[PDB]
Amino acid sequence: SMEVTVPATLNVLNGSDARLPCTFNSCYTVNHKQFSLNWTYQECNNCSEEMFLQFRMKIINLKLERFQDRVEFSGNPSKYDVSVMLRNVQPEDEGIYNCYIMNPPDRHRGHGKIHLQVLM
Amino acid sequence: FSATPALYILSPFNLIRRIAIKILIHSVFSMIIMCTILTNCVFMTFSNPPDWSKNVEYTFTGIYTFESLVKIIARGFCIDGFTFLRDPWNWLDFSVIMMAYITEFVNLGNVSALRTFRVLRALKTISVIPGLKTIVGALIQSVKKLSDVMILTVFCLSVFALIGLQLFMGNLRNKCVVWPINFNESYLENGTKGFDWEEYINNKTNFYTVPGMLEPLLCGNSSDAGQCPEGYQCMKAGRNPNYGYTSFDTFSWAFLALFRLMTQDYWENLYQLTLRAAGKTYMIFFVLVIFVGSFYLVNLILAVVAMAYEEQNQATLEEAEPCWYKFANTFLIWECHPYWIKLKEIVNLIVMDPFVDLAITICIVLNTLFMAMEHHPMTPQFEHVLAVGNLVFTGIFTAEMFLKLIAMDPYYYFQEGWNIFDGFIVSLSLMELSLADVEGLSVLRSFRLLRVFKLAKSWPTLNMLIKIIGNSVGALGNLTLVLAIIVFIFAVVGMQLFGKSYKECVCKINQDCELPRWHMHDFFHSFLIVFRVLCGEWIETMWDCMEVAGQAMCLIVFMMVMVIGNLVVLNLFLALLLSSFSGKSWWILRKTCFLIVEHNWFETFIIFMILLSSGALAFEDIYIEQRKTIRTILEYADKVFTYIFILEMLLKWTAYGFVKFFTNAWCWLDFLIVAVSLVSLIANALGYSELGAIKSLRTLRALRPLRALSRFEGMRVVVNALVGAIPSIMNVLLVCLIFWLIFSIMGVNLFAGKYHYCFNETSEIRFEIEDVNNKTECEKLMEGNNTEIRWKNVKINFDNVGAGYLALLQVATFKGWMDIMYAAVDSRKPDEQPKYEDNIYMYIYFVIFIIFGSFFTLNLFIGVIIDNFNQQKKKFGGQDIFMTEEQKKYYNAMKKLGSKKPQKPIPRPLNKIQGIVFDFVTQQAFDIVIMMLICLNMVTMMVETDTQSKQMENILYWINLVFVIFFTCECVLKMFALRHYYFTIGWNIFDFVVVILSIVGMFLADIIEKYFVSPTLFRVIRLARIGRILRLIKGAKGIRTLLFALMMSLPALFNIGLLLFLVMFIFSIFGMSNFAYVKHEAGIDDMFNFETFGNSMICLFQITTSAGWDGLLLPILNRPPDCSLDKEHPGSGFKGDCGNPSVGIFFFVSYIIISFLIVVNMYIAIILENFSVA
Amino acid sequence: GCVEVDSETEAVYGMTFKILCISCKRRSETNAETFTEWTFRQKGTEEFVKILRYENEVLQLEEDERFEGRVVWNGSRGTKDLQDLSIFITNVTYNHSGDYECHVYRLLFFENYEHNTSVVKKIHIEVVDKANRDMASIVSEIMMYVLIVVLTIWLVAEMIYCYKKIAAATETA
């Protein structure tokens, strides 16, 4: 896949801030136009996957009902950070963050897996 | 074994300590460590170690831990004397084991570095295998000896790098930028519709990029530099070529480029790029750096290493002064029947020892000359003849083997090594016919070539070759093992450091996102890269690995590979070489003509005449329909040249006599040239001025400069020496031809016919082998389509021993071999489309050839040349064989004048102020501060870079002002001190000329506002500043002695230079005649071609160092299928787009040989002179 | 490709002449679509008039009687990239003097960048009846003969001097 490093497991307090990043190191330092990053979220392992964040030549947030105005992208693709932060975490957010990335000039298209759980 | 005065804790009398010592010395421990380390090296060779061998790695680790435990319980702690901390390699032991214990658990994030640091395990072989420590030590003393030459090399590359920086500053960036600025549609990068200069100038699609090439074309504003097409200008625009590392725009890259020039590694591309950017007139700089930094510095390094190795070798040679028998006697002895014994005696007599050797060797020679006759296109009758001859010859050798086996008992038969070799060959021969349907495995039939080596008993010189090959794995098996271990450790270091990077960054070096041809991913390819660096082609892969995996790592790794590997290969070469080493009017008329011939002024006149007549050939080029007045005046002076030379022939005849004149080779040469010129003269004077071989005789006029060989004394002496040394070279050349014939026949068997393509040249992609496998379906594609799809052949193929010799000379000269190896390793079947690296292991065929027929044969040839020149020197009392008698007087004059001169110390003048000022100027403190400010000026020169900020330019300007003021003030102080006695030493004169010329430079910088604005002369008078840093050599002693050696050896270099230039002239005229109007395909461009004397001499000087001669040859070898036989060629009646292949091969092969024999004598005249200094 | 040569400035009446103009591309790879116009005016006459226009496939000549049925094209044959702009005149008359100017118009093709260029070369010819064969070749012939004679004279003088001197030397003993 792609050389993407993520926190394997993160714990977040009830309603507290949570920043779950996808850092990645590749050749061909990231450009802004032809580059693409994707973010998929799953409410559980074996249930449906949901697109909620795009960056196709520009930041494109799908603004799902699960992440209406809570997930915000304040990362840095040039600094190899496509991080998403979830404010006011809610227990039905317990699931899988998957970030999909494609560095334009290489073709080492890859994937990402993040498991987030919320404590009672 | 014990010898233990240690007396440490855990008393040496203990049972445990005694057991540890007993097992430690015991050789089975060493053997099991050998097995462990060899398996460890193999597992290191493994690229991605599968987890089912991770525990095997732990097993190896535990073995190392056990060894460490034993060595610690046997005198471990560092406190006691003679412990294992006193022995350096056990530092390596502790380091590697401790770093393993660091590695298997949490560690630093640099996984690649910690993985690489396992190479110490492979390095352990150097410590533990017996004898290797001494080899490493000897390498260390040789390196320690070459220190002064390293210092001089560094300072010389620094001086020349400053020259190149100041001359070619930024010129490498000159690109053909679209000039007619199209403002109305000049979009900005963020969609502004506005125009910004720094975005237009660096936008990559505003450059030319000659269709087919990769880098955008370099261009130039000079009159002779490259030419921009219509609609482009020559502003410096964008990144440098070759990813940005080929540049003179800073002292770092200038130093890299001139270290590249020093080793001549792919220096023809720097030559072409810089001459296309800065103008062809700068070839003077390249000649200067090749005849000083390349030939001389490399010669000096090799001479000093040779001197050190000879000294050490001579010092170390001087300091020295039944149970199976009973089974054998029953089965190995074949006397069991009286008639059988009678037959044994009979056949032993029927051997006819005097008349068996001739028969068997005749059969061997006929066998090798039958194996020579091989082709891809073979008529079935001819292949049948080859097969039946093969059967006949193998039957003959089987008959000889069986006859000898029955004639002498197998015990005594196999007791001879020659007989065991013969048995190996005959067994290998028999296993062929039985296995006549084995898939692939075409290598097996190649072993028959070894029969030729049975001529070793005949030749003494083929025995010398076998002696060299044996000494490689005999007396010097340990040193070649050191070489193998080093080529292994570098190969695995590369694979662990840059191996993953070459796969992550694929699209940064190869535009198709495929692995480049020569990468460091696998182990085989890493070994290939390190071998290539040993061959000499480091830069072309250093660029790629710098582009994928960081500049610093590749620079360090490849400099280490070059230095260490070349040191070891040089040491192995010299090791082998030193192992090998040990009335009454007719009489008055005749004497009057003799007197008029022997007149010095008349000889000068004829020299001027031959020079003019020879130079008149230069004007005969493609720019001859212009300057018609020049062509007419030169044509009508050709007649008077012919007249004067016929007159000289007649008058020499009268002076000397027919017998006296025709017993001299030079007189035959002159007569032949005059006769052929006169024959052409009479042919053109008559109506038969064309339409025959007369026009082909016309180009033979290029031989006219040969009269200068007879006239000029230096060229005559050099040609005399070469011709005298030919006879000792004929036998060695015969050996080299036989051995390269073995290699060429094996290459034909491996590759014959497997070098065909199918271009669709409209796309010019070699069809991948699933659309067209066979030749037959490529024909199908043709018959469906039009000629836009063809079945090409690599032009330097291996399809018969002739093409084999050509392609193999290319492979052995390390120029043009890359395409051959690509088309070999892609080769799969004779009539099948090649597939990308489907036969990778054919690389080892070229590795074997370079090891044997390019390294060992070169070693033999060099040894014989050195022996011959030693003999020739000893004949004439040790005098030089490249100097005229007046040159000998010149030599002896320097020999006498180079001693220690009791110079006058300039006594103090009778003034107190003068006394103190001479205390100032004579004190050593004043000299050393001068040297330090020269060093400061040198660093502030090297800090000048392209694209530097204007503030930096002003700061450098004012600091240069300060320094030049300081130097001028010191100069005028010394003048006021004693002008008349300081105009006595030449060093001071150099100081005065450099200071006044720097003052001229700065005055003209201020006053460039005149009618004579000349930037180029201004950069040259800036280069004039560099002369001051040459004063540092005055404070040196060994460097001064070495420069004295160059000064003392100049005259021989000058004579050989005249000869080489005259050869360049003849071949350049031949190129102007034949290889003008050839297609501009690859290595022959709009410039660096044969269309003019300037461009032709450019190409010949490039070829003189063998650089890229495949490039020049390749466009000649094409044919009207890949040409146009009737091209328009405007401005000239000449037609046809490409020349004659046969004369193309003869032109370049004969130049490579001739140039090689010339440049070699340049090396010998330098190397041997350096020896004679001390 | 680059031998830019002027035409000849002498034409002899009744036989043929070769008008020569070679515009050479600065880089020969570039492939261009080129066409030309030839402007002509007689001696002591008004401004030029076009006579022949060769555009990449065929030679269209103006209907002037001064050149009809007696002018043929000797440039590059059917390549659409002329690079060789040569007019051939058969049966030269006295009218065909004055000033010729070859107008060449190039449309160089690049990666994604067309370019239109124009070059004008001026050639002046004069028609004679006897071929006034040039001065360089004649002065070269006199140079040839005088040099041959003077070298022969030098040789004879030197050899007679040496003969006399050494005969006087040998008569001494």
Ligand SMILES: *[C@@H]1O[C@H](CO)[C@@H](O[C@@H]2O[C@H](CO)[C@@H](O[C@@H]3O[C@H](CO)[C@@H](O)[C@H](O)[C@@H]3O)[C@H](O)[C@H]2NC(C)=O)[C@H](O)[C@H]1NC(C)=O
């Ligand atoms: C280097 O110069 C070339 C030549 O101008 C630039 O290519 C040009 O790029 C612009 C914008 O990227 C293109 O304009 C666009 O055209 C499309 C229609 O396909 C239109 O919808 C857009 O709104 C915009 O106007 C233009 O077509 C294109 N020209 C060519 C011949 O490719 C190139 O972008 C420059 N390089 C850099 C790094 O700026």
Ligand SMILES: *[C@@H]1O[C@H](CO)[C@@H](O[C@@H]2O[C@H](CO)[C@@H](O[C@@H]3O[C@H](CO)[C@@H](O)[C@H](O)[C@@H]3O)[C@H](O)[C@H]2NC(C)=O)[C@H](O)[C@H]1NC(C)=O
């Ligand atoms: C692309 O980037 C360039 C520069 O980075 C942008 O140029 C800027 O454009 C704005 C809009 O016109 C300029 O602001 C105004 O400029 C006028 C010029 O007379 C001035 O009088 C106004 O007071 C105001 O500053 C700005 O100067 C100009 N340059 C910079 C450095 O900002 C351009 O707009 C960008 N294109 C897009 C599509 O964003």
Ligand SMILES: *[C@@H]1O[C@H](CO)[C@@H](O[C@@H]2O[C@H](CO)[C@@H](O[C@@H]3O[C@H](CO)[C@@H](O)[C@H](O)[C@@H]3O)[C@H](O)[C@H]2NC(C)=O)[C@H](O)[C@H]1NC(C)=O
């Ligand atoms: C080859 O010759 C040309 C001129 O003979 C050298 O100078 C170039 O001249 C043009 C104008 O004729 C410059 O264009 C203008 O430059 C200014 C500089 O700031 C720029 O801002 C404008 O937009 C305009 O494009 C061109 O820049 C200039 N070249 C450079 C590198 O500045 C040319 O330098 C010569 N090439 C060599 C010596 O390699």
Ligand SMILES: *[C@@H]1O[C@H](CO)[C@@H](O[C@@H]2O[C@H](CO)[C@@H](O[C@@H]3O[C@H](CO)[C@@H](O)[C@H](O)[C@@H]3O)[C@H](O)[C@H]2NC(C)=O)[C@H](O)[C@H]1NC(C)=O
């Ligand atoms: C060798 O490789 C070249 C690569 O260009 C092949 O030429 C290409 O052939 C295709 C065949 O369909 C051409 O496509 C055609 O394009 C025109 C213009 O857009 C369109 O009107 C047609 O309907 C069709 O799509 C393509 O233009 C052409 N390219 C060039 C540069 O000529 C060629 O076919 C290959 N030959 C073999 C034997 O594989």
Ligand SMILES: *[C@@H]1O[C@H](CO)[C@@H](O[C@@H]2O[C@H](CO)[C@@H](O[C@@H]3O[C@H](CO)[C@@H](O)[C@H](O)[C@@H]3O)[C@H](O)[C@H]2NC(C)=O)[C@H](O)[C@H]1NC(C)=O
């Ligand atoms: C090179 O030439 C050889 C014969 O000289 C080709 O072998 C023949 O290849 C074709 C197609 O690759 C085969 O036709 C197909 O065979 C398969 C089964 O093998 C069948 O299922 C198909 O219906 C079709 O008939 C043909 O049988 C085969 N010849 C023989 C004797 O089996 C070879 O393919 C050529 N290389 C190429 C085309 O790359």
Ligand SMILES: NC1=N[C@H]2O[C@@H]3[C@]4(O)O[C@@H]5[C@H]2[C@@]3(N1)[C@@H](O)[C@H](O4)[C@]5(O)CO
């Ligand atoms: N230092 C090198 N000298 C020549 O030998 C190698 C080669 O065989 O021949 C040329 C040079 C080479 N590198 C390669 O870059 C390539 O193959 C070639 O340039 C292109 O013609």
Ligand SMILES: *[C@@H]1O[C@H](CO)[C@@H](O)[C@H](O)[C@H]1NC(C)=O
């Ligand atoms: C740009 O186009 C305008 C038309 O509006 C024209 O007047 C002007 O001359 C053009 N300038 C350039 C540099 O193309």
Ligand SMILES: *[C@@H]1O[C@H](CO)[C@@H](O)[C@H](O)[C@H]1NC(C)=O
């Ligand atoms: C090229 O320029 C010439 C010069 O006037 C002009 O006559 C012609 O029409 C132009 N053609 C093109 C395609 O630009």
